[PDB]
């Protein structure tokens, strides 16, 4: 029985480009997490308590997804490489603009998974494409959810009253179409 | 004991114009159902989640009413004839205009039942007029309900904040005067 | 952030041939639903109450699957296009022949999904192939189930006693190999 | 305040032809009841215990409906006139033929109500047409039920095994399409 790069028994070697692509995706999700934290703070600064709670939860959830990827690399007996994390964007002129960045961050997370998926398909690494499929399914729901929150916020058209109403929806856990 | 057109024992023959009128009404209710589905989608496209849930339920309910009519034709040993279903209207310039079409669709459903009622009265088919009476009673409540939703939406006068408030009412099941 | 054809924020554009293929599949499932309704009626006309209940449930379930596809198009910010629905087949010379049409309808539903799957694979639309995979899994079980019901009905070899026994199985919810 | 023919305070006079028609209908339902009793006995004589239980219940139910009409005449301050009751038919060559007579008896019960309904309509006695409407609704379900039992028995085509299976359905309370 061979040993993998992290030292555990190796079920099947992984192409080093696929390894790097996964390590990079872990960074994308760690960066989405700190971005949601910055958005949590920005909302809290403007007394948008529901939005603040929502993004606080999104930051923790996104970090869990990152950890889930590190566990997969351990499962494949591959080395992890936790990288330097850029500072997040921290300033926006409005909630609408903040939600636009949030939607883009979620969509870009899905894009990064798709790239890892396509690279694994090329290398015929079927464990990885299989492992990734539920994570892409969840990203579809996350994208639907952020499109919902962004569109609802844009519908408000900057009116504080509408934004307060939506803020209370979020504090109550009403965060998707349902 | 005679056999009816669908092959079951026949309690009492039905005039073929009355049969056709019932088969056509089944189509009206099937068409109301897919119309409510299209309205469900239109609302979902604009993040009006409460309205989306309401019309999703109305589509299923209207389909049940259609099925209820097919069971009556079976009870009378008459043949069913499920027809080609037109595509629904799918585009509206505003919620107010959508709710106007919804109200008209509900009122037109009642009109179609009334026509079947009047035709059965002419033919002295008392089973049918008796069978129809509870269904007209429910249509009165449905008309009251859609007049309520339409009028409330018009009262909002296109203000997004008011429409968000009404959207949340609908998501909570607050769909009539009560 | 770009807007998709239905007006919501767009996570990733979809090839218009893939869109049309999905809109067409929605029609196939809507048509399977009304076909199961017609079969429900045909069984009810012959006092096959268990078969009638089974197909009444299959019609509602198949409609739910259609709605599930419309929600996916909303999730992808694509336009829905609910189409004219053909009338279903409504006449069969025997239960065996009806069950044969039912099996073919279920198999053809799976074929239509496979075509959408293959088209999405060509366009590298990984959200769609991922979204479709559970639906194909369920179709395998549905095909196994209809092969079971069809084969059991053929085993009866037209004997009314055997068909009554199977009818009671279905009324009790005994609808698969288990 | 005037007194009616039975001596109670009279809310509204009833045409004597309408009174007689109601008194005659009471006899029809009393006769249906004893007919179901005779059918109960015929089934018991052939060890068809489920059919025997079913018709024993139908005899009691039909008698209750007769009593319900006598209460209406009391409510209208009209006289009751319980008439001589003919002997029921008591002999049949087969269950199929017995079920045919049962279906006809149920259909003839509905016809007699319809006649009373039409006579009340002519006399504009709206209490009576209103009172009768639920009873006609129930007759539609009774007709659907007896068409179901008759058709199922004919499907058996005289095979004892199939008739035993149906007998057990009835003993378990499986007496309609459901
Ligand atoms: Cl804003
Ligand atoms: Cl509006
Ligand atoms: Cl067969
Ligand atoms: Cl027989």
UniProtKB/TrEMBL annotation, chains A, B, C, D:
Residues reported in the UniProt entry to bind Fe(3+) 3: 133
Residues bound to Fe(3+) 1: 29, 62, 65
Instruction: Specify which residues bind Fe(3+) 2 according to the UniProt entry for this protein.
Output: 62, 106
Keyword Metal-binding in the entry? The reply is yes
Looking at the keywords, is Metal-binding present?
Answer: yes
Protein name as catalogued: Ferritin
- Provide this UniProt record's keywords sorted from A to Z: Metal-binding
